[PDB]
Structure 1
Amino acid sequence: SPTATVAEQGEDITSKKDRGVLKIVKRVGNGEETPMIGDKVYVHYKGKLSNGKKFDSSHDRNEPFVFSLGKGQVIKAWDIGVATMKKGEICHLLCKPEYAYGSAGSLPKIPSNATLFFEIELLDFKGEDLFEDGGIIRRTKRKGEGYSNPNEGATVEIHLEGRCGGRMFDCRDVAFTVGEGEDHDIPIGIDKALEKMQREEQCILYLGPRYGFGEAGKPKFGIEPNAELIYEVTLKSFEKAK
């Protein structure tokens, strides 16, 4: 029985510790960092019911399954389970209905209140390409708490850390207006990325030359024209404009 090991020796990784999701590592991955919130992840999975029958796998699509993590584009068990994996790692998941499909189930193969089994391999994980151009890459350190997002003309209060290829140049808590980061010596990218950020959201930002300081560079910071920068943005508080 392949489901036996994860059912009896599986580590509970749920926040409530209700045994909703149980995990067993089959192959150890490589590296140190686990994929973050919003990060684009590439996987190969195999889903089996409590009776043993397979219902869904990425291999019969003949391609890797890809999604944004933490966004609820998959079942809750995946969002949590994969967020604990390393690159190249294979693991097993025993997921209670509360972290899967629940009392309603899924037509036509998943029954009501079904406990499920999953073997997922994390093939690769990449950052969140904020504008589908690779210009600004986001990797979220911490989830925010916001129903809304700062708009153009929104007054904001953020902590900001900026480095130039490994040399940090900017560190401060700034209060400014969205669209007008220029005045406070702030790249266009930050202002562009704030529009897709929540209250209390920490994230790391990889800026392309187009969203850095541009052909001008930044002399007071000692930054050459069209330089790639790395920022940590912490949106503390904001007020949207009319």
Structure 2
Amino acid sequence: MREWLDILGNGLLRKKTLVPGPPGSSRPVKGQVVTVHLQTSLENGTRVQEEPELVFTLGDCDVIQALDLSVPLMDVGETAMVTADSKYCYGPQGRSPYIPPHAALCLEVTLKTAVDGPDLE
């Protein structure tokens, strides 16, 4: 009822947060090794490239514009459908021939673990 939960302004990054993140396990501040399950599906079809383990630094030149902007406001244990614009996401400069030029494709961001630097030698 009445559109999706939007971070940018008019549309573009439309992250509808379905499961929030339960009390105790809550959103991380900017400087943590944060881990997501990101499965990519098409605008008019189904799963294009299903990649379940993406570990990365919070607020860093690594992930797409659709992830990095909504990444400081992600409560620990979410399941949230990100309908991202083609210039913000992988589309023309992206991951071809699987992910196409143009078309705003959906990608579900499910937060697994927010860990502050995991040291293992």
Fold-level similarity (TM above 0.5): yes
Q: Call closer, same or farther: CA 1:105–1:58 in 2, change over 3 Å.
A: closer
**Alpha-carbon contact 2:79-2:111 (below 8 Å) kept:** yes
More contact order relative to length (CA 8 Å, sep ≥ 6): 2
TM-score (norm 1): 0.44
1:37-186 superposed matches below 5 A? 37-59=30-52, 64-128=53-117
Partner of 2:66: helix, strand, or coil? helix
In the TM superposition, residue 128 of structure 1 has moved relative to its aligned partner by: 4.4
- How many aligned residue pairs are there? 119
Percent identity (aligned):
30
Q: Which residue of 2 aligns with 1:23?
A: 15
Which of 4, 11, 14 pairs up with 2:5? 11
**Gapped runs of 5+ residues in structure 1?**
134-242
The residue type equivalent to 1:10 in the other structure is W
Q: Call closer, same or farther: CA 1:37–1:128 in 2, change over 3 Å.
A: farther
Partner of 2:60: helix, strand, or coil? coil
Q: Call closer, same or farther: CA 1:42–1:98 in 2, change over 3 Å.
A: same
In the TM superposition, residue 105 of structure 1 has moved relative to its aligned partner by: 4.0
In the TM superposition, residue 33 of structure 1 has moved relative to its aligned partner by: 4.2
**Alpha-carbon contact 2:59-2:71 (below 8 Å) kept:** no
The residue type equivalent to 1:13 in the other structure is I
Inter-partner Cα distance in structure 2 for 1:22 and 1:36:
22
The residue type equivalent to 1:12 in the other structure is D
Alpha-carbon displacement from aligned partner over 1:177-224 (angstroms, at most 9, x marks no partner): xxxxxxxxxxxxxxxxxxxxxxxxxxxxxxxxxxxxxxxxxxxxxxxx
**Alpha-carbon contact 1:101-1:113 (below 8 Å) kept:** no
**Alpha-carbon contact 2:14-2:84 (below 8 Å) kept:** yes
**Gapped runs of 5+ residues in structure 2?**
none
**Alpha-carbon contact 1:45-1:58 (below 8 Å) kept:** yes
User: Is the helix fraction higher in 1 or 2?
Assistant: 1
**Alpha-carbon contact 2:49-2:98 (below 8 Å) kept:** no
TM-score (norm 2): 0.80
Flag as ranges the 4+ runs of structure 1 deviating above 4 A: none
Q: Call closer, same or farther: CA 1:103–1:44 in 2, change over 3 Å.
A: closer
